[PDB]
Write an enzyme that holds these catalytic residues in place. Structure first.
Site, short mmCIF file in Angstrom:
data_model
loop_
_atom_site.label_atom_id
_atom_site.label_comp_id
_atom_site.label_asym_id
_atom_site.label_seq_id
_atom_site.Cartn_x
_atom_site.Cartn_y
_atom_site.Cartn_z
N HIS A 168 -7.26 -6.37 -0.43
CA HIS A 168 -6.40 -5.43 -0.18
C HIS A 168 -5.23 -6.00 1.18
O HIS A 168 -4.32 -5.45 0.86
CB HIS A 168 -6.54 -4.00 0.76
N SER A 216 0.75 -1.78 0.11
CA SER A 216 0.12 0.26 0.04
C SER A 216 1.13 1.47 -0.35
O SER A 216 1.43 1.56 -0.77
CB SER A 216 -0.87 0.17 0.98
N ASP A 249 -9.15 -5.35 -4.97
CA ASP A 249 -8.29 -4.12 -4.46
C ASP A 249 -9.31 -3.44 -3.96
O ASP A 249 -9.66 -2.36 -5.13
CB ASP A 249 -7.54 -4.41 -4.48
C1 LIG Z 1 -2.64 4.06 1.99
C2 LIG Z 1 -3.72 3.07 1.45
C3 LIG Z 1 -4.48 3.40 0.61
C4 LIG Z 1 -5.22 3.13 0.45
O1 LIG Z 1 -6.72 3.29 0.64
C5 LIG Z 1 -7.34 4.04 1.61
C6 LIG Z 1 -8.33 4.40 1.61
C7 LIG Z 1 -9.05 4.72 2.72
O2 LIG Z 1 -8.42 5.35 4.00
O3 LIG Z 1 -10.87 4.94 2.56
C8 LIG Z 1 -10.92 5.03 0.91
C9 LIG Z 1 -12.21 4.30 1.06
C10 LIG Z 1 -13.41 4.42 1.35
C11 LIG Z 1 -13.99 4.42 0.79
C12 LIG Z 1 -13.90 2.35 0.75
C13 LIG Z 1 -13.53 1.85 0.73
C14 LIG Z 1 -11.64 3.17 0.50
C15 LIG Z 1 -10.19 2.81 0.58
C16 LIG Z 1 -9.77 4.13 0.79
O4 LIG Z 1 -5.12 1.15 1.61
C17 LIG Z 1 -4.02 1.82 2.26
O5 LIG Z 1 -3.21 0.84 3.08
#
Ligand SMILES: CC1=C[C@H](O/C=C2/C(=O)O[C@@H]3c4ccccc4C[C@H]23)OC1=O
EC number: 3.1.-.-
Length: 266
Positions: free
Chosen positions: A245, A95, A216
């Site tokens: 993920h 990530s 993912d």
């Molecule tokens: C550094 C990093 C980025 C990544 O996506 C992070 C997300 C987060 O925090 O809310 C976002 C969100 C909002 C709704 C559904 C899924 C996600 C995933 C996204 O996953 C990680 O580890």
């Protein structure tokens, strides 16, 4: 130097002539590597550490002005390796750490023999002729959610991130996710989403393996293809036959096979 080693909870385990760094992602710490670790420790010297934003690292050490870009995280990583006197290594990162690894390999190309990127994206925000998977309003809603009620946000997010129905994995991820300082969590998330690495991907000389799962939540399948196409080094995409993920938590034996293969020659 030595204090940083203590601050970031640096550990070196295993036996082998080849050195691998395992660098964890958002919402976890190095304990997330515990299941894949035994596959590596026979053939590798493995370095583990916590990112400064990890819940297992004292929040006093977190500097909001300093850490407002990923280059500061890179500083910590390079300082760790120099402290440990490691001249060359393979880097595996997940990530946000995949982002950190890319930047570090550009900064110090002599230091990084190979990159293995898991759940990696150069940019999350959508753009013209670029699908990152997120729109400005969508991410905004997240920040508000993280800001208003953090625990509630975390409770909803953890199973989406794991994404396979694997209750033990959801629980392990929740442990380290809830224990993060809510303001630090938000800050890292804001830093990551303002990061666009597309322009510097061509500057990476190191051979790269992009590890991609079937689904993912933060990383569209087309992004892995983008990385393979735009990374400056010899790059291959390895596909896991499962989703999520956090494959090192959800399917560690499967991820271990890809890792053993990726770290074979560098
Ligand atoms: C550094 C990093 C980025 C990544 O996506 C992070 C997300 C987060 O925090 O809310 C976002 C969100 C909002 C709704 C559904 C899924 C996600 C995933 C996204 O996953 C990680 O580890």
């Amino acid at each position: 130097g030595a204090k940083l080693l203590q601050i970031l909870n640096v550990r070196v385990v295993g036996s082998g002539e080849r050195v691998v760094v395992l660098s964890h992602g958002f919402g976890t710490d190095q304990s997330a590597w515990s299941r894949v670790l035994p596959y590596l420790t026979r053939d590798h010297r493995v370095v583990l550490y916590d990112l400064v934003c990890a819940g297992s690292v004292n929040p006093d050490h977190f500097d909001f002005r300093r850490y407002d870009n990923l280059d500061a995280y890179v500083d910590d990583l390079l300082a760790i390796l120099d402290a440990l006197r490691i001249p060359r290594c393979a880097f595996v990162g997940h990530s946000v750490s995949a982002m950190i690894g890319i930047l570090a390999s550009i900064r110090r190309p002599d230091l990084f023999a190979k990159l293995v990127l898991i759940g990696a994206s150069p940019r999350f925000l959508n753009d013209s002729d670029y699908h990152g998977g997120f729109e400005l309003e969508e991410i905004q809603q997240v920040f508000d959610a993280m800001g208003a009620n953090y625990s509630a946000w975390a409770t909803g997010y953890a199973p989406l991130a794991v994404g396979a129905d694997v209750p033990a994995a959801v629980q392990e991820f929740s442990r380290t996710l809830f224990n993060m300082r809510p303001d630090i969590s938000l800050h890292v998330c804001q830093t990551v989403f303002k990061t666009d690495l597309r322009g510097v991907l061509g500057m990476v000389r190191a051979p790269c393996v992009v590890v991609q799962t079937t689904r993912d939540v933060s990383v569209p399948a087309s992004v892995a293809a983008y990385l393979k196409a735009h990374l400056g080094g010899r790059t291959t995409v390895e596909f896991l036959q499962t989703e999520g993920h956090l494959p090192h938590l959800s399917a560690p034996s499967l991820l271990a096979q890809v890792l053993r293969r990726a770290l074979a020659r560098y």
